[PDB]
Amino acid sequence: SGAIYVGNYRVVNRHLATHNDWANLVWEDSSRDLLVSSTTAQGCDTIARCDCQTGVYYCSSRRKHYPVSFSKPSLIFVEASEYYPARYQSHLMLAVGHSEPGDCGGILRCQHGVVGIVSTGGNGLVGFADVRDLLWLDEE
Numbered sequence: 001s002g003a004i005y006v007g008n009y010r011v012v013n014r015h016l017a018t019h020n021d022w023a024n025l026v027w028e029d030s031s032r033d034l035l036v037s038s039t040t041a042q043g044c045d046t047i048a049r050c051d052c053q054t055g056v057y058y059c060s061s062r063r064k065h066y067p068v069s070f071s072k073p074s075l076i077f078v079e080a081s082e083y084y085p086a087r088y089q090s091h092l093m094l095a096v097g098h099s100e101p102g103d104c105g106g107i108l109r110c111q112h113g114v115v116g117i118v119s120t121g122g123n124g125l126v127g128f129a130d131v132r133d134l135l136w137l138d139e140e
């Protein structure tokens, strides 16, 4: 589990969105595994606006933050899970790192701010849904 709290937005994995998230929906995209809802309180996270390919992510299944090198956001085939059939997920970045399904939501960050959240993984891989292109997260 986990979310990004930037401005009056809450960014979560779409497959982990709550009823409250759907009832306060701002934007969702199944192909990216992302959903954004509105919040009453202001958040403290800031979004990275950069082209970093190194950063640090939080792994809840180890209670640890790990440094990683990750690929550029791309269209990758993701195996069937409890929440989606086997399909292509867009804006996904892969790295070598430990992950288990419940690690979804953990933040990946770089020196500039939040880069994305854990969304896929398996067998010593971890995949992150990028948010750096969602410029509207920084305003209104």
Ligand SMILES: COc1ccccc1CCN1C[C@@H](C(N)=O)CCC1=O
Pocket: 015, 033, 078, 081, 082, 083, 084, 089, 099, 100, 101, 102, 103, 104, 118, 119, 120, 121, 122, 123, 126, 127
């Ligand atoms: C960190 O994720 C791991 C790690 C190990 C093994 C599997 C996963 C996640 C598998 N999966 C894919 C998600 C997606 N973005 O399509 C949907 C929900 C889900 O359970």
Ligand SMILES: [Zn+2]
Pocket: 048, 049, 050, 051, 052, 110, 111, 112, 113
């Ligand atoms: Zn950066």
